[PDB]
Write a structure and sequence with these properties.
The structure is a homotrimer.
Chain A lengths: L1 E7 L2 E10 L3 E6 L13 H6 L2 E6 L16 H14 L5 E6 L2 H12 L4 E7 L19 H26 L11 H12 L3 H13 L3 H4 L6 E6 L11 H7 L4 E5 L6 H4 L1 H13 L1
Parallel strand pairs in A: 3-4, 3-5, 5-6, 6-7, 7-8
Antiparallel strand pairs in A: 1-2, 2-4
Helix pairs in contact in A: 2-3, 4-5, 4-6
The complex binds chloride ion (3 copies) and sodium ion (2 copies).
PDB class: oxidoreductase
Keywords: structural genomics, IDP00046, Bromoperoxidase, Bacillus anthracis, Peroxidase, oxidoreductase, Center for Structural Genomics of Infectious Diseases, csgid
Assembly: trimeric
């Protein structure tokens, strides 16, 4: 229940995954800096609705290897390719949460749709989060990005504590998950690679997926919160929907970034409607 | 230190175990939703007394694989059998704590007594924990059972926080462990399979071991607290003792469910006096 | 990346991580933590052009948790197997707290052919035990027994308290966040209870004074002036005095865990010594 996806200095880089149930495959791709365990509220709904659910832990996160390099989307996407190939998956639905939307974007662009029936962008970073002189439309400027980087560099554990509180907060509303659930998530992020945790920030904030979204001509759903403080709908999900013909949008009212946990009922109803269609 | 005990969706199921010391083998089987680490206070006393001590993590728990299926006693007992077979254990004592009493009961019933010297039911779920009009001497009625399942389904992490508090409390006394120790146990439970955690509730509450206990013709010890909130003596150990006429009881005054930790000396004394010839 | 080094029936494996390319710097963590304790050193070392290897001592972090071998003969044998398996050359061994014991015993037992330099950081040599005959130690019998009975009786609570002192410099108890402290508590909580206990005797009562007589290579002592567990005066000071040509970096306000609280100074001292 590890996939070997490469080597670094001749040591295998191994990806931890879980593969549950019977049915068409739904591959769930977690956000930063969490793991496959962040999909707790989705897995049973999906299996009960007749799908086979695969989660995996991105390199550097969860129970996967912690290499020094490879923390960019070409490699992240190759890692996903090895998983789909090794499990011999067909008619797959790719569900990318937050930075996992990047693997989705790039997978279609690089490897095409032979194996892929449908895709879902859930609170996801495309089309391109960076705000700059060349891309004045985006959400995250250098200054904002540097704060994340400097937090991870100077006190990652305290920064993660703060980040996880905000991840499940919608505006003023900070009671959408229990303190135990928050701490649980903090601890999943605590164990991650410090290097991978840092490099991911650059990857998810500054990778431009616009060219990739062009190759999308399969059914596509955007699930997103209207109160997402990390990846604002107007700068991400809304534009991914507008980039992709025939895509559907489920804007969840009062949904924060971690809306798959906070608004599980609504998230799953939108996801399940989309899959059975 | 893993044993492969099966396969599901093309991937092995592995059980983590530890094997310490030299002498007669004593296999310690943990309760829900913890791991082999719950035996911290027993292992050293057993090793020092000249026993070889094997702990393992039940499928779905601790460091073992987290599959989707197999969370019922036929499989759990099959996993135990493979552990005994693979480690070639002879002249074994099985010690089952809480739901681990179920593997004890079912092993003897299914595989016989040829490998087995003695057995111990510690705060253990047999004979049959379900409580109903027709089976009034169970411990857990439908409503209670549904409160467990609901808690795990809707906020497992908060539910576990509360469960761990009651686990070590003897009536109104809740200072029997430190907060650090309780939180340690919380974290062990947090990392378990959500599905395994849920299905176990049905396994331990609705499995009838009465027929299995009929086959116990080997020396049997019941160790149980008189203040066990989760598995009360009167509706479990007391009845196991009555079901197995040879059996000895060590009823520990002020003992909560987690009495192997709160009353380690009294627990260990009962175990050592029984283990000896 | 990470890998396992093979070192009843099941092999003992040591978990290690190997990052970057260049001359190797092998970081040996203190009790009862793991390789993850080096968080603040790894990046600066690789950025400076070194390869950084960390490993988890048997019983700790992600390594096997056997019943025996929790003494410096075996701990140093484990280190030797790792360096042999990786075929390392020109190594700088960095031993934090009890990890200075592996450094001392490695040079004494296996010699220096694979080793260019050594660093004793907040380290337990020359001999941490404090007694009548050996007043120059740090830890007396009453203190040692407090550690043992704490670990036997409520290891989790003992660790919570230990981790508070680890990062405190006298009255400065704000040097790390609660989050960081609790992260370190959890790393310790998952270690072997048996290894955790036996290490106390290994780090407190092993005498490395004859080992330090074999040191004829460049040597840096990095130590805090406010280390409650391993006071400079009874450790790093004496290790420096034992070793000719050895350098000292005494960090002002540094507690035991100064590699985290004072990363900037710890790292400056280390890099200056590595390139010389
Ligand atoms: Cl993300
Ligand atoms: Cl149980
Ligand atoms: Cl130490
Ligand atoms: Na953990
Ligand atoms: Na027998």
């Amino acid at each position: 229940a590890k996939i070997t996806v490469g080597t670094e200095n001749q040591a295998p880089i191994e990806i931890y995954y879980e593969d549950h149930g019977t049915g068409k495959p739904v591959v769930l791709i977690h956000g930063w800096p969490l793991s496959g365990r962040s999909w707790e509220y989705q897995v049973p709904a999906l299996v009960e609705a007749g799908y086979r659910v695969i989660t995996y832990d991105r390199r550097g996160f969860g129970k996967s290897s912690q290499p020094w390099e490879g923390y960019e989307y070409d490699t992240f996407t190759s890692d996903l390719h090895q998983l789909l190939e090794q499990l011999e998956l067909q008619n797959v639905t790719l569900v990318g949460f937050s930075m996992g939307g990047g693997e989705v974007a790039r997978y279609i662009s690089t490897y095409g749709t032979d194996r892929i029936e449908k895709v879902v962008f859930a609170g996801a970073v495309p089309p391109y989060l960076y705000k700059s002189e060349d891309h004045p439309e985006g959400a995250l400027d250098d200054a904002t990005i540097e704060t994340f980087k400097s937090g991870v560099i100077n006190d990652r554990l305290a920064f993660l504590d703060e980040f996880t509180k905000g991840f499940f907060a919608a505006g003023d509303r900070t009671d959408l998950v229990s303190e135990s659930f928050r701490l649980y998530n903090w601890d999943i992020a605590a164990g991650a690679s410090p290097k991978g945790t840092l490099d991911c920030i650059t990857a998810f904030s500054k990778t431009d997926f616009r060219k990739d979204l062009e190759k999308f001509n399969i059914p596509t759903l955007i699930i997103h919160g209207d109160s997402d403080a990390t990846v604002p709908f107007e700068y991400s999900g809304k534009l991914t929907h507008e980039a992709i013909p025939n895509s559907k949008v489920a804007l969840i009212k009062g949904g924060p970034h971690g809306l798959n946990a906070t608004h599980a009922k609504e998230f799953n109803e939108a996801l399940l409607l989309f899959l059975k269609d």
